[PDB]
Design a protein that fits this description.
2 copies of one chain form a homodimer.
Chain A (H helix, E strand, L loop, with lengths): L3 E3 L3 E7 L2 E3 L6 E4 L1 H18 L11 E7 L4 H8 L12 E3 L4 H11 L6 E3 L16 E3 L4 H15 L3 E7 L2 H15 L4 E8 L5 H12 L6 E5 L2 H13 L5 E4 L7 H4 L3 H4 L3 E5 L5 H8 L12 H8 L25 H22 L15 H8 L4 E3 L8 E3 L10 E8 L5 E9 L3 E3 L9
Parallel strand pairs in A: 2-5, 2-6, 6-7, 7-8, 9-10, 9-11, 11-12, 12-13
Antiparallel strand pairs in A: 1-5, 3-4, 13-16, 14-15, 16-17, 17-18
Helix pairs in contact in A: 1-12, 2-3, 4-5, 6-7, 12-13
The complex binds the ligand N[C@@]1(C(=O)O)CC[C@H]2[C@H](C(=O)O)[C@H]21 (2 copies) and chloride ion (CL) (3 copies).
The site of one chloride ion (CL) has 9 residues of chain A, from strand 2.
Chain lengths: 442, 443
């Protein structure tokens, strides 16, 4: 498989779902544009800015070794061998992965070589356990909080009889387990609990929907699903003409790919995303990307062909521009940039203590000690989030986690007939909803 | 800790045993583990000696060992298991173990990256049957769907319809109880409460579990899918709180003495399960003849001796003891250990017969052994009479399509015998249907 490599004095590993999961034979399927390509390019954008920052590692260039997880933990683990083979390349730290199952599988390999790891999207509560994930940190909070936010949405609307659907794996199952605990504490009962396996068919999704219809009093379906599972569930529901009030986690969030083609089935859905903002300079950087000037990204030409349904062989790709089309910044881009900066700040603070007389890598950091870097620097960073709007701070808590803050969205059909996500609320140690923005709310 | 049991050979087999219990929050390794630790490790060494003398099983190919200690911890086991792959980055042809499902899964994730076949003698988690994830794993034991079905059938037989469940956190406990619950539901069995035992539970936290179970006085039956230490500590807490429960426990508790020792009263009337087996021949004699001077090959034996006879070698006079003098109860899964080692030798033998026909020695075609072909073409197709089987038995060793063993279990009850001593009695079995006889059950 191909790899993205950038030269530096210290090299940061990267892990992203550049491609979707493949079919029954192949590990890798189509290019994953939003949570794959954009997130990868956000890490490249962050590295470029750090490398030109006079106040952050002025004498230490940050390189990269970025791998594709193909949205599959076993494939991510096979790729993750490149990070450790230079110990039986030299990787100082790893940024990634996205999926909780990928981050857990990778963390269990990285800790064996004391490589620090910072995830920008893995929300599984299991990852908060430092006796098991002692080299793991994340810029995102655990789903202990997300599950409360979802139980409280149901409690506010008095939805006391609901069904649940969880993605098989750490994320979905432990997320739904936390949701169900939090719902029972607020006297919300569960009609049925469905599961979506890691290799389900389109007909098997229709089975899930039929199973949810077997309890007609439960109109509210609570999802702790991966985007693809939310997408297929919704497509199955459109096909069987089933109507549900969806309440879904960040896996769905405010992704257009989830609802595209099943807008009618999704209408009225309440979704959650981790509280974030779009990073302004990232948008001009991404929209400038060009298949002729972006050779450092080995998956960019395959992304271009898919996005613009063109062929470089057929010479019909140049007519397209990311400048000439609309740009929707993926919700967790801020978390990617914060993870790269958190690692850069940690190495900078380590450099200040270990190399006081030079801006260059002194012998004390040849090589970088993984234990010290994680325990005494990564966990202790505290800085103002870069490219933030006119206020956020990057830091890790005692479990190496981010802050439990969430945005609440609703999926609606506007007066024009066009569909959109609309921010209707917020959760941060308590629920705040603006019912005037929810079309079906009284 | 960092001791490794090494034995030279033409082909080296990796080994993995919980030679020590898990330590406290500051140490990876705790006290030496006699029954599921020392005895199983010794059973592998016993099998290797007997294979290495056998003229019909690899006559010109000596099998070596690289045996590691998991310390009953999946993170520790995996740090140790790097030894198995550091060459492929001495060469390891296949691996025997581990015991705990979480250990076996963690190691299988690593070994498959290097196409290293693995055979467990005790990990029963259904997750391990998934060949999209554990394509180099096989086992001499069945997956826990069968154990969980057997448990739901035991309840249904006695009309125990409102019950409680206790699971050790992880892929053995949680998935075992989850399977049990689906089988119990279909048999009109309800669940009062479901408790989880965390990996770092305190004496107070176990008492909290007992009180959580007491909050439902209608449910006197508690179904356990727990690791032996969790069951030991839950019984200890029940004894402390004068709590009375009808225990229905998986192989984790099984027929272990250590689980019941000191909590006999809280344990009395327990229905426990173990995988169907027999004590093997020659091993009882092999184990009892072990001394701190002849057994230098096992670096953990002196520490086992010190624990067993409650003495110290530094202070001396530990020597004036013998395993022959003390009684010997062969650990229930010793047969699975020997079967796993023999399964690998037979797969290696059959591969040798096909790829090296012109010599009894290791030819080029097996220099190195191709792990993918070893697993797919030979390990999955082994079929042989179980070594050291008892008189007038037709036990065979084989694997199904997915590398799993056959769902056959023995059912036990924990009772006070006529001599006043507390003990486990065989009162039934499950092999595609429940057979138990009420007569041997005192209640
Ligand atoms: N929070 C998730 C997880 O697996 O931990 C759910 C699905 C996938 C989300 C994302 O990449 O934005 C990440
Ligand atoms: N069957 C178990 C498992 O973890 O899969 C339960 C606890 C431990 C048992 C044993 O070593 O005898 C093994
Ligand atoms: Cl990923
Ligand atoms: Cl083990
Ligand atoms: Cl245990």
């Amino acid at each position: 498989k191909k790899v993205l490599t950038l030269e530096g004095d210290l090299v940061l590993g990267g892990l992203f779902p550049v491609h979707q999961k493949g079919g029954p034979a192949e590990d890798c399927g189509p290019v994953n544009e939003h949570r794959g390509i954009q997130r990868l390019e956000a890490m490249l954008f962050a590295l470029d800015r750090i490398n030109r920052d006079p106040h952050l590692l002025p004498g230490v260039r940050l390189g990269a070794h970025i791998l594709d997880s193909c949205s599959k933990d076993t494939h991510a683990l096979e790729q993750a061998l490149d990070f450790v083979r230079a110990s039986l390349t030299a990787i100082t730290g790893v940024i990634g992965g996205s999926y909780s199952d990928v981050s857990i599988q990778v963390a269990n390999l990285l800790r064996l070589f004391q490589i620090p790891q910072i995830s920008y999207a893995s929300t599984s509560a299991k990852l908060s356990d430092k006796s098991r994930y002692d080299y793991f940190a994340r810029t995102v909070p655990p789903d202990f909080f997300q599950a409360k936010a979802m139980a409280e949405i149901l409690r506010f609307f008095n939805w006391t009889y609901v069904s649940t659907v969880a993605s098989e794996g750490d994320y979905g199952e432990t997320g739904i387990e936390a949701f169900e605990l939090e719902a029972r504490a607020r006297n919300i009962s569960v009609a049925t609990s469905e599961k979506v396996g890691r290799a389900m068919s389109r007909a098997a999704f229709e089975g899930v929907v039929r199973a949810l219809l077997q309890k007609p009093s439960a109109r509210v379906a609570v999802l702790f699903t991966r985007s693809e599972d939310a997408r297929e569930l919704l497509a199955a529901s459109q096909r069987l003409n089933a109507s549900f009030t969806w309440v879904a986690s960040d896996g769905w969030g405010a992704l257009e790919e989830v609802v595209a083609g099943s807008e009618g089935a999704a209408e009225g859905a309440i979704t959650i995303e981790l509280a974030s903002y779009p990073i302004s300079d990232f948008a001009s950087y991404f929209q400038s990307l060009d298949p002729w000037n972006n050779s450092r990204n080995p998956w960019f030409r395959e992304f271009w062909e898919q996005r613009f349904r063109c062929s470089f062989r057929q010479r019909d790709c140049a007519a397209h521009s990311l400048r000439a089309v609309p740009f929707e910044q993926e919700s967790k881009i801020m978390f990617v940039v914060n993870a790269v900066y958190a690692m850069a700040h940690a190495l900078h603070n380590m450099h200040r203590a270990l190399c006081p007389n030079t801006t260059r890598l002194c012998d004390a950091m040849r090589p970088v000690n993984g234990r010290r870097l994680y325990k005494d620097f990564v966990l202790n960073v505290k800085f103002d989030a870069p490219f933030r709007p006119a206020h956020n701070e990057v830091r890790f808590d005692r479990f190496g986690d981010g802050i439990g803050r969430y945005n609440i969205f609703t999926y609606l059909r506007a007066g024009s007939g066009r569909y959109r996500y609309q921010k209707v609320g917020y959760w941060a140690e308590g629920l705040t909803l603006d019912t005037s923005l929810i079309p079906w709310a009284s």
